[PDB]
Amino acid sequence: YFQSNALPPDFLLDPVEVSQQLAPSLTELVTLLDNARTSEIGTQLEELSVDYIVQGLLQMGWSYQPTESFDLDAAAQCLGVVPTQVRLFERLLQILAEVGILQSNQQQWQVQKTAQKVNPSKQSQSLLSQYPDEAATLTLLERCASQLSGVLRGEIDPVQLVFPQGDLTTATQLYKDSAVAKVMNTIVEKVIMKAMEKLPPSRGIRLLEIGAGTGGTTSYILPHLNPNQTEYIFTDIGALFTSKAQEKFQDYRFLGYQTLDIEVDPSSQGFESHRYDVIIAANVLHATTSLKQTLSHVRQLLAPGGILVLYEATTRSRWVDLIFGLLEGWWKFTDYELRPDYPLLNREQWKKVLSETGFTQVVTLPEVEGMAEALSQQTVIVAQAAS
Numbered sequence: 394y395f396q397s398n399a400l401p402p403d404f405l406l407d408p409v410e411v412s413q414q415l416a417p418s419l420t421e422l423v424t425l426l427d428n429a430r431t432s433e434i435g436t437q438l439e440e441l442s443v444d445y446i447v448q449g450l451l452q453m454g455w456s457y458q459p460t461e462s463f464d465l466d467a468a469a470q471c472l473g474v475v476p477t478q479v480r481l482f483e484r485l486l487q488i489l490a491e492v493g494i495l496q497s498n499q500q501q502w503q504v505q506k507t508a509q510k511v512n513p514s515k516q517s518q519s520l521l522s523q524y525p526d527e528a529a530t531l532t533l534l535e536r537c538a539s540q541l542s543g544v545l546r547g548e549i550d551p552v553q554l555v556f557p558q559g560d561l562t563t564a565t566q567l568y569k570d571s572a573v574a575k576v577m578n579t580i581v582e583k584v585i586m587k588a589m590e591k592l593p594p595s596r597g598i599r600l601l602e603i604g605a606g607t608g609g610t611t612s613y614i615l616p617h618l619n620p621n622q623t624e625y626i627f628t629d630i631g632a633l634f635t636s637k638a639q640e641k642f643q644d645y646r647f648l649g650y651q652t653l654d655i656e657v658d659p660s661s662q663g664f665e666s667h668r669y670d671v672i673i674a675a676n677v678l679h680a681t682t683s684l685k686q687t688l689s690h691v692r693q694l695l696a697p698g699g700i701l702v703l704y705e706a707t708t709r710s711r712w713v714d715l716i717f718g719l720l721e722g723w724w725k726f727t728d729y730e731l732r733p734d735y736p737l738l739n740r741e742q743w744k745k746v747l748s749e750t751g752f753t754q755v756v757t758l759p760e761v762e763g764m765a766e767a768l769s770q771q772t773v774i775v776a777q778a779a780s
């Protein structure tokens with residue numbers, strides 16, 4: 394029975410082996426997603442996003458006419474974009490170019506077509522009656538994007554728009570109970586419960602969640618953990634998040650709460666190096682300045698042979714730009730050799746930097762043949778600390 398608990402968690406299954414065994418469960422799980430419905434709603438949200446950008450630009454006095462060329466800074470200064478929001482402002486122009494309203498050569502911008510009248514809020518409500526199931530996303534897009542000009546002009550701290558004290562959950566319902574998040578979060582749970590199904594009765598398991606928010610992904614895991622054999626450290630950079638979560642999860646008695654900034658050495662923050670079996674980071678690692686230093690801090694927490702579970706969006710999204718792209722974390726990135734103009738990585742980029750930062754046996758999920766395109770826009774990545 395008893396082997397020494399000081400020795401590494403050799404009992405953990407391999408991510409590839411976990412992926413193999415869950416494969417039939419995933420082929421049934423991804424068909425529960427509506428191919429057309431989540432595709433329809435995705436396209437329309439990208440069209441709505443344009444409306445919000447045009448609405449916001451006009452409210453700042455945008456007066457540029459077709460053929461006219463302007464400089465990015467000059468336009469920012471004209472419309473009153475505060476200096477810290479010009480990165481976001483550039484991306485909003487890049488989006489107008491994708492749809493043909495603007496064109497870009499050099500760092501100069503030329504108007505192609507005059508933008509027409511928009512009422513994105515009237516159209517938002519239409520979408521809400523059509524698709525009440527994505528109400529969290531439209532409500533949050535409404536609160537953040539219908540205030541874009543306030544944000545670009547620095548009159549609103551976007552934190553109060555995305556994560557105000559009186560409402561941290563709306564941003565979590567997006568991460569937790571959207572159609573796609575339900576699939577991805579179930580994978581996170583099934584992966585974690587499969588990886589540990591060989592845990593000796595003699596040994597406890599230690600999990601640590603980075604950037605856990607108010608527990609969007611956490612809530613999928615906790616119902617399956619064995620309180621007698623588990624320690625679960627709920628961390629976030631913000632104390633308001635851990636405090637709301639402690640309220641939500643108060644009757645799970647095996648939970649620890651603590652604050653962690655994954656951009657600074659976790660050992661300087663009260664965390665033991667290389668003594669966590671499983672690290673969860675859902676939708677957080679991208680929001681840092683250097684993925685290599687961030688992933689090296691993550692690696693520093695993992696026991697030899699321990700498991701990282703990552704949940705990340707992998708594609709550009711205009712409606713996401715109008716919510717989380719308002720925040721500092723979205724544009725923190727400075728590792729331009731890897732991330733030239735957007736904080737997110739695709740599946741192949743994530744595998745690459747993970748192998749460079751001391752991980753192996755990297756799996757990306759789901760990978761099912763006829764799955765919805767929307768399942769290719771997000772991924773669960775499982776990787777093993779390379780002993």
Ligand SMILES: Nc1ncnc2c1ncn2[C@@H]1O[C@H](CSCC[C@H](N)C(=O)O)[C@@H](O)[C@H]1O
Pocket residue numbers: 565568569603604605606607608609610611629630631634653654655656674675676677680681722
């Ligand atoms: N540098 C950092 N270190 C740790 N957490 C961070 C961080 N920067 C941002 N975060 C946290 O990352 C979270 C992104 S939203 C949280 C998502 C969460 N997994 C959920 O499903 O609810 C925020 O709560 C934010 O506070």
